[PDB]
């Protein structure tokens, strides 16, 4: 997250860190046994870390659970990034508490202008690299699809939504992928892609979760 | 994503690590220093 702020410790209880030796992507806990992330975050072996604030310090609120099942959306395109969503079934149900909680799926698609909260441990710099120890937060609005299209000519599908600022300055960045975009208590987006970070005319592009509620629910029930 | 990969640094004359996002990789991107030097080491 570039241009954000350090989240209040454990104030984003649904935020998880996907780890395979090091933190490499974010994710969101949707039920005590399932996490939703980005398909481009796929790895054959993934450890889910919940209740994290400082990913480099054992604070005492963490829960480490391995991914038993990793299911990418069947229509995920690794080039266009269309359908960039993935589900992870945990090897064991996590213990829910004030610091490890679930986030609700969308009741319907949120319109442009809706204010949301983006979070993650991704790079905090537009130029150069700085990997934060502490979870970063960013309040940003869902942008009109026309503006998203104008910023990314011919690259935006209805399964994508731009969130951020056309003037740049604040945005998600490498390492935030798979993380949450929560608006009014509902997971409306998943950190996916973009050109650079916090650059003018190139706000981040996110997977539009409201288009996948049926797939998510069907997949969980079948696995 | 934050994926650690290797690239050949021509100025340094050796392969170093960098952060690859996980998609649309160019060719100066390897999973190991050995594969990187084998391909780009010259000679």
């Amino acid at each position: 997250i570039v241009g954000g702020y350090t989240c209040q410790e454990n104030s984003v209880p649904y935020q998880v860190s996907l780890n395979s030796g090091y933190h490499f992507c974010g994710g969101s806990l949707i039920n005590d046994q399932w996490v939703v992330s980005a398909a481009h975050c796929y790895k054959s072996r993934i450890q889910v870390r919940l209740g994290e604030h400082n990913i480099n310090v054992l604070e005492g609120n963490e829960q480490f659970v391995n991914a038993a099942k990793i299911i990418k959306h069947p229509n995920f395109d690794r080039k266009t990034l269309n359908n960039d969503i993935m589900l992870i079934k945990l090897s064991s149900p996590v213990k829910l508490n004030a610091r490890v909680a679930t986030v609700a799926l969308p009741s319907s698609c949120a319109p442009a202008g809706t204010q949301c909260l983006i979070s993650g441990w991704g790079n905090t710099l537009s130029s150069g690299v700085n990997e934060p120890d502490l979870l970063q937060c960013l309040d940003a609005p869902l942008l009109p699809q026309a503006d998203c299209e104008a910023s990314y000519p011919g690259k935006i599908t209805d399964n994508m939504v731009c969130v951020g600022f056309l003037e740049g300055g604040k945005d998600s960045c490498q390492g935030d992928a798979g993380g949450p975009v929560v608006c009014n208590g509902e997971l409306q987006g998943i950190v996916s892609w973009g050109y650079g970070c916090a650059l003018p005319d190139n706000p981040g592009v996110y997977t539009k979760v409201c288009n996948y509620v049926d797939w998510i629910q069907d997949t969980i029930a079948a696995n | 994503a934050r994926i650690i990969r290797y690239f050949y640094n021509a100025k340094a004359g050796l392969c170093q690590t960098f952060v690859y996002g996980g998609c649309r990789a160019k060719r100066n991107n390897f999973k190991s220093a050995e594969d990187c030097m084998r391909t780009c080491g010259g000679a």
Binding site: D176, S192 | Y8, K26, N28, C40
Partner: peptide, 15 residues
């Protein structure tokens, strides 16, 4: 050596 070896490392669009 191959031309691509002389290009700067490319992070790409995935964030």
């Amino acid at each position: 050596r191959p031309d691509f070896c002389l290009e700067p490392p490319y992070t790409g669009p995935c964030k």
